[PDB]
Design a binder for this molecule. Structure first.
Ligand SMILES: CCCN1C(=O)c2ccc(Cl)cc2Nc2ncccc21
Ligand SMILES: CCCN1C(=O)c2ccc(Cl)cc2Nc2ncccc21
Lengths: 132, 132, 132, 132
């Protein structure tokens, strides 16, 4: 009857994941996921990080995730307005830099970094799987 | 109910697709897919080709597919002996040479290349999706 | 017989150019440049603007330039008191807000942005080269 | 009477460096430096590596250097044929993969990696300074 995830997505755990086939800025990447009733990558657990790390281990490219902020004294937040759970990962790089478009997190070679949201990167959309 | 593909595979059309965890000559890549109840990638259409190109678009690795021949005087055949549909893609690369283990094709950055089957590469495995 | 520019600077045209070492506010950045017998960047021509754009093309950071104003009713002026030539660039960003310490301009990704001079950024310093 | 380095280059120590203004594949990047009587970045000392790490500390982008090999059966060699100096840096990433157009080294966030030479990346050209 109901398939857990659409074709071309990857079903893992409670979620479905879609890896982009090209690089786009964080805003365009966000809009792609919204149009598919999804959101940008939200890592909720170490299991989620390990899965993503394995999936992107084929790649040296950067992948946008749904974590951002505009002010470096204020918390990183996922698009849904929740914070980065402690003990998942450290955002490396120039975490204190502000940019006109804000600061956004990306994963590259398994490590998470801060960067100018205006840069074009691959991205990963995530939605809940249709489980029972 | 019955999900079309196991977790961590890509469901596309009537099949499920998986990237190999490691890099191996073509024979060992063939044994690995068979031991997972699958076979090496078989491209039956340009839509298959487009899907695969998109799926590997974030990787620069070569991926073995199930296409091979013993030397240029034999036709290109898939693992199950069926023919290469000639107009789907041109096999570039080492198409004049003869190797002790034969010639095999991999996909890299959208294009298909002939290469010595003894060379190590990643691969893509494929099995039937569980539909209706 | 003597060198146009010190080591680690970039000689272009009749001047020498240097990236700041740290990301600070416009005030402090103007001071560090004065330390080096230099001033903040003054863009005097499209040729100057094109050189800077190429010089920062491998950076996503913003770089303070020597352009600033007290409010949207006071004109954009370089440090030497001279005005911004309109054809060089339109200033984007916060061109209608009013900050205590004024509005300052930085260049990023080829474009120029107004921003509170309190906020921290890298900067480009400029001084005259020793011509023939 | 002559300048150490041409305009738009960075003079450092005994050498001149030219950062690319865009991202290009390794063959194009190499062709660029050759057209300037130069070569791609050759790191022959810890001092060179340290200097390059600070010059690219403004950037999260990848920069091609002049170190390459056709496949793992060939040795890692600089463009001039000299070997990778022992104990200077490790080439990280997938050093044992075989690409159609060879494997090239790049620096990113101070670390050196192997990648498919067909990718587009920034680059750095290097030439002897014309000095005393
Ligand atoms: C969003 C950018 C993706 N990307 C890299 O991140 C990248 C990574 C490494 C190298 Cl050497 C060169 C690179 N340039 C590049 N070229 C073609 C396709 C992808 C890339
Ligand atoms: C050759 C690739 C250069 N590059 C990055 O390396 C890069 C680095 C990080 C992120 Cl998040 C996204 C990136 N994409 C990107 N977009 C525009 C200009 C440059 C880049």
């Amino acid at each position: 009857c109901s398939a857990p995830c659409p074709q071309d997505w990857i079903w893992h755990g409670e979620n479905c994941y879609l890896f982009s086939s090209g690089s786009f800025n964080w805003e365009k990447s966000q809009e792609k996921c919204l149009s598919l009733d999804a959101k940008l990558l939200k890592i909720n657990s170490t299991a989620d990080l390990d899965f993503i790390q394995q999936a992107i281990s084929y790649s040296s490219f950067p992948f946008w995730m749904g974590l951002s902020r505009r002010n470096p004294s204020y918390p990183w937040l996922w698009e849904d307005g929740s914070p980065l759970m402690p003990h998942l990962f450290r955002v490396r790089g120039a975490v204190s830099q502000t940019y006109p478009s804000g600061t956004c997190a990306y994963i590259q070679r398994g490590a998470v970094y801060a960067e100018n949201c205006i840069l074009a990167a691959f991205s990963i959309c995530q939605k809940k799987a249709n489980l029972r």
